[PDB]
Amino acid sequence: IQRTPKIQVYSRHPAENGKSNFLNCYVSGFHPSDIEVDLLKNGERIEKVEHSDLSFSKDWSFYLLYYTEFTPTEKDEYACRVNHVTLSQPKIVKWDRDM
Amino acid sequence: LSSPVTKSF
Amino acid sequence: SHSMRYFYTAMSRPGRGEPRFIAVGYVDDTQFVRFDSDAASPRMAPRAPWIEQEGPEYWDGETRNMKASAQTYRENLRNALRYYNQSEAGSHIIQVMYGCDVGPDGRLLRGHDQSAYDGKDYIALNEDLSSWTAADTAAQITQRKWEAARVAEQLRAYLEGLCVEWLRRYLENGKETLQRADPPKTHVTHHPISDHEATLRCWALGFYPAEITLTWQRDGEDQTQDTELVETRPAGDRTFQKWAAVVVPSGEEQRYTCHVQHEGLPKPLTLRWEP
Structure with a gap:
């Protein structure tokens, strides 16, 4: 059994330029459990990233929330990079403040 | 509180 | 229960x-x-x-x-x-x-x-x-x-x-x-895509428990099939977030209403884009 991850990149609170917030990367629906998740700032890996405890849904698929403290600006680009046995190349999902 | 019941396969 | x-x-x-x-x-x-x-x-x-x-x-x-x-x-x-x-x-x-x-x-x-x-x-x-x-x-x-x-x-x-x-x-x-039950904080955002279309996004933020219903209506008609409804996601603070977006033709925005049903709401909310 192999299930590819669903990925959502978003903030804890509505984005306000220069106001502190949390950048989240929610990965869910995957199997097996081994997964690599990185949050990016202008294409570079953010080092202070935490994650929730591995849990799973009623269908046995795993979910994890990866999160980091961040301050949105007008020019800075944020993204989440995910790797899993199901992925040919890592997947990069850009942060859109309107999503 | 978790289950104390042994579930040996 | x-x-x-x-x-x-x-x-x-x-x-x-x-x-x-x-x-x-x-x-x-x-x-x-x-x-x-x-x-x-x-x-x-x-x-x-x-x-x-x-x-x-x-x-x-x-x-x-x-x-x-x-x-x-x-x-x-x-x-x-x-x-x-x-x-x-x-x-x-x-x-x-x-x-x-x-x-x-x-x-x-x-x-x-x-x-x-x-x-x-x-x-x-x-x-x-x-x-x-x-x-x-x-x-x-x-x-x-x-x-x-x-x-x-x-x-x-x-x-x-x-x-x-x-x-x-x-x-x-x-x-x-x-x-x-913590009721959702709601708002509708509007994002022109081109000179002829725009995204309406209904936000439900900070709610608990996870169970929620967020739907869009156009003139009182349910838009489930046309609605991009993201999976309920943890805000990271034990509350949940969800959004439902619809791409609408420019000029129709006022006919769209977002409907939020949640345990923490006494009565269901009805929201529109407020320019």
């Missing part, structure tokens, strides 16, 4: 050490405990404020029980490998979820105990709390061992006794958050 659930994941990793065992516990949508066997010193740990008030016999008892479980699950991984005649080279996973549901009066409504092997159902305790449903020949070996060993009688005693007793306790202790 309320529920308590435990989730166990046991994963082998040949050439990479002994199997890993992770357990998490929930009351309703609130994670309240965790255990991970990879930790230097594995312990059942709190994840919600209202559980922090449980005494050390609780945490020690839970840690002991989790380690005995991690050990049973490593043996179970070896047994499953023999039952399935699998190679010692592949990584395998057993998952388990069990717990109880109680009604508004606190009486046991239903007990649960389900296990999976490599992401597939393996064996489950039936609602009668006295018999098992085994998914395959391998799981039947387990079922017979569990019938001989009176495992269902033991689980029933747990589900009708301790499980219910403890859930009642957690609900009283966490009454301020577990029994107080």
Whole structure:
């Protein structure tokens, strides 16, 4: 059994330029459990990233929330990079403040 | 509180 | 009504050490405990404020029980490998979820105990709390061992006794958050895509429990099929977020209304883009 991850990149609170917030990367629906998740700032890996405890849904698929403290600006680009046995190349999902 | 019941396969 | 659930994941990793065992516990949508066997010193740990008030016999008892479980699950991984005649080279996973549901009066409504092997159902305790449903020949070996060993009688005693007793306790202790529904903070945003279309996005932020219904209506007509509805996602603060967006033709925005139904709302909300 192999299930590819669903990925959502978003903030804890509505984005306000220069106001502190949390950048989240929610990965869910995957199997097996081994997964690599990185949050990016202008294409570079953010080092202070935490994650929730591995849990799973009623269908046995795993979910994890990866999160980091961040301050949105007008020019800075944020993204989440995910790797899993199901992925040919890592997947990069850009942060859109309107999503 | 978790289950104390042994579930040996 | 309320529920308590435990989730166990046991994963082998040949050439990479002994199997890993992770357990998490929930009351309703609130994670309240965790255990991970990879930790230097594995312990059942709190994840919600209202559980922090449980005494050390609780945490020690839970840690002991989790380690005995991690050990049973490593043996179970070896047994499953023999039952399935699998190679010692592949990584395998057993998952388990069990717990109880109680009604508004606190009486046991239903007990649960389900296990999976490599992401597939393996064996489950039936609602009668006295018999098992085994998914395959391998799981039947387990079922017979569990019938001989009176495992269902033991689980029933747990589900009708301790499980219910403890859930009642957690609900009283966490009454301020577990029994107080946090309504969503709502707003509608508008994003021109081109000179002829625009996205309307209805936000429901900071709500608890996770159960919500966010729908768009155009002139009082449901737009489920045309609505991009993201899966309910954790805000990271024990509350949830959800949004439902619709791409609308420019000039139609005022005809779209977003409808929010949630436990914490006395009456359902109706929102529009307010320019």
